[PDB]
Amino acid sequence: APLPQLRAYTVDASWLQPMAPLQVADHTWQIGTEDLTALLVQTAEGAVLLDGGMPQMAGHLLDNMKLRGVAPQDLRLILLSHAHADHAGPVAELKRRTGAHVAANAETAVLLARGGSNDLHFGDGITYPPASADRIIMDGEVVTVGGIAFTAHFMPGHTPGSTAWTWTDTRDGKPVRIAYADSLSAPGYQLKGNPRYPRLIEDYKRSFATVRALPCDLLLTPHPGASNWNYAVGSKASAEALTCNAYADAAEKKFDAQLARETA
Amino acid sequence: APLPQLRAYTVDASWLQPMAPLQVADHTWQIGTEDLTALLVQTAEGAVLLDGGMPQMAGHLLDNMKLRGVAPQDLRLILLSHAHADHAGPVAELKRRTGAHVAANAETAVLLARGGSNDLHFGDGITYPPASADRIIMDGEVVTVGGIAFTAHFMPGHTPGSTAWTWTDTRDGKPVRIAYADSLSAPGYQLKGNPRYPRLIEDYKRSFATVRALPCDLLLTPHPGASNWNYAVGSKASAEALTCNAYADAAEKKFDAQLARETA
């Protein structure tokens, strides 16, 4: 009767199904997979990447960046929604091969430094290669690259450093306010009386209000289905996409239902 | 045709077979498994741990420490042979639950900081929870805990920070010089013209001479079979144990055979 073997982080096959760059606005592109969002913004002074998905997506992201005419050293910045394995996986590998810098809040930085290990809810079950944060950003701080300003909005809940990024692009000259909000889910989390996260409910509730107030005309999420995006249908991907209110209102109802069943 | 799934680091079942503390000398104890060495030294001022094996061995090591009458906060120091997954696995978890400090050279420290990721030979295939080094030690530096002096001897080869630790204990009053030398193997390594390790052959050859010169009366290795230790037979474990010369002489012959076949 020996000690058990290590277990690998296995996900759905749709999370790893590669797709070609699907255009969102004049400057924003989806270069991830069908069920994992990885946003690429092209400016005149370089490129900015928002999330990257699973650790084995590094080569696929570089192929799509080459498809958009972007060299590795043209990726100037890497922004994260939250530092979990299915979103900040290839960050370490992408920093070594692109010469890019990662900006994240202090809570996302410390979790990125230990590669998702010692997670508040998952422990060491979802460990990915660790990376370091080059620039610590605060709540409401503006990050400007090539004229495009990225505003951070702290929405702690899924992780203590969960962050929503808001910027303004164009839809053929016509401006558009895009909001890439992080997840509001608590899969298997202990909400009531968690010794590792005592103020979790206060952070989740306040984050529900933060998402509703974001300046947004088109919403995206790290998991496209959570905001009713269908990356696999191309042009009609944003057809049934939700609003900030509907996304936060739906996520809050299932949080209170989960909170209610947890008390029983 | 999606991207492949992550693969877990699977080892032989004998590496995870727990055993009770097997006494080596008056103060040194083997508290690991049958095929993974984890040494515990008990002093009057606390305990010192040398290696820990696989990441899922943390609880087993604490159980054997409790069996020897050692509290978690009595573990003062954690010494490493080299920072690979099958030897420094539970180091991060053991630091959180014991209040111990880790001493290692700069090369072992940087590899421990990124949890075995970006390995020179294995890449990201063997990633374990990352840990930090509290004290950077140099070649030949003496680390003293409770009167027992631990002398470090840099033997780079398997890893750039591979280290052999030498201390003197007692066999019922009679002193004994114990040498815990690291591995001299290169499993699947590219020896000739490795762009990640140009001076690898020079480091391996010089490390072969360093092991032969160690002051030793009883030799141990992170893998007991590499020094002909048989932990599963109790008292007769050190029966056929090798010497420093025989251990370095045998490891060098298979290095030159591997070097010869690699050129062809």
Added chain:
Amino acid sequence: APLPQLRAYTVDASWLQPMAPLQVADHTWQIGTEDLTALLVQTAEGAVLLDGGMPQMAGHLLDNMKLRGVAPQDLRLILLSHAHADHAGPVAELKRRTGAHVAANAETAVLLARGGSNDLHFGDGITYPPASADRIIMDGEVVTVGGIAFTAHFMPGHTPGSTAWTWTDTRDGKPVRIAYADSLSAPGYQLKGNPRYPRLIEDYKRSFATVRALPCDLLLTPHPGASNWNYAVGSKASAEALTCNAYADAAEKKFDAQLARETA
């Protein structure tokens, strides 16, 4: 006309005036200087240090710990109010010479990692030896050492990771709720429209309410004069000491006065 020379962080002479351990409660002791608070709590399972002052106070703190009958390896934990040079200075040196662990929130951890450099308000003017955080604590998390429970209360303002620690001791059997609240000052800070800290006013105001609500019978601050403590008079030190309300009410009035004059 060459570039200017480096300038050292000089403080008032009263900040560096050493004093003997002044007893606060049955287990809490003041072992710092006359104008810099460094609290020592003695339990049956080890000692806990709260702040340490200037970097050159490391030897003085160890002398007072020896005066209280505490060995270096008996210091189990180091807690911080905020990671500035005049409070977390000797933390790096104290970790090397005591075998202690440092617990701090993510914001205090990242500032401690870069040794106070790249400060939001002071830049690189107040740099001290860097240290690492061993345990990341969340808001409201309980840290227990030897039965004495330390509850953290995030009060961001002076620094993004400013923290107040609350524990219950005894005054000769009679229990007492002691609250070690951090500073609420903003010396020379830009409050309105600070690009490095956009939500500073919201954090300061909410921290004013957090201090008023702390369970406290005896209040202490990193600077004793800020809470009307007079360490230099021994027994009568806590004579004119303020309450949580009076301390937060006074600090808020001068914040609004500073905010008013800044707008003009």
Added chain:
Amino acid sequence: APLPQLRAYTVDASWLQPMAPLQVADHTWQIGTEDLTALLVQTAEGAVLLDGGMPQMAGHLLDNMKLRGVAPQDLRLILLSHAHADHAGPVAELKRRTGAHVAANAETAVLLARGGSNDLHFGDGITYPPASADRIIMDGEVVTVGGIAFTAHFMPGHTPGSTAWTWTDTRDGKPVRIAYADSLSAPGYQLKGNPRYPRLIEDYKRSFATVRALPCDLLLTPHPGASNWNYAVGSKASAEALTCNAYADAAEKKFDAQLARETA
């Protein structure tokens, strides 16, 4: 009688005397001060910086980079001789304002992480803002940027991670092998029986032989006077410049003289 005040790292005024870019070869430029070497190499794919001097030289280096027609985001790499305050000072500030990556060996990386604190010989007397190493390089590893290959040669002595960088440039079409060797001095070091550096003499002696064997036609050093460079005379700067043999032969004679007087 209070504790002493902190002391700032003061240097000679000639170390901080700014100068204009002085051309060395077709691609290598000196953009530091009169007595502190900071080399800039311009390629078609970006720029590479070798050392930077004192921490307050960051703005001056960027001004000279702008003088050479190099944008901040065009600085791709920062290479270090050794991680002391008078050579890796502005590295942290230059990483934040240029988007560059730092490559260094493990020993230079760990010393850069703690900002020169806990020095083997100087303690905490020369602390500078800490920085992180993005890429760990090994002995003899080739670092290529824009076609120009930089070969690292470990020469431990002044610091455990002292490194000499060798690359080949052109003198108007005519190739030239430039070697930027680190210092071989031991100012006030304890050579014989240093508990923090037991194998120091073995490292110094072997580094003396490593410098003599470097492929070099024009030698430079972090301190120009150490290799008989006179940056203040423009074209005649390399007039009396030494060779690799003469530089290592002279440094070894004063090492043995220092070693001889230390024994007495």
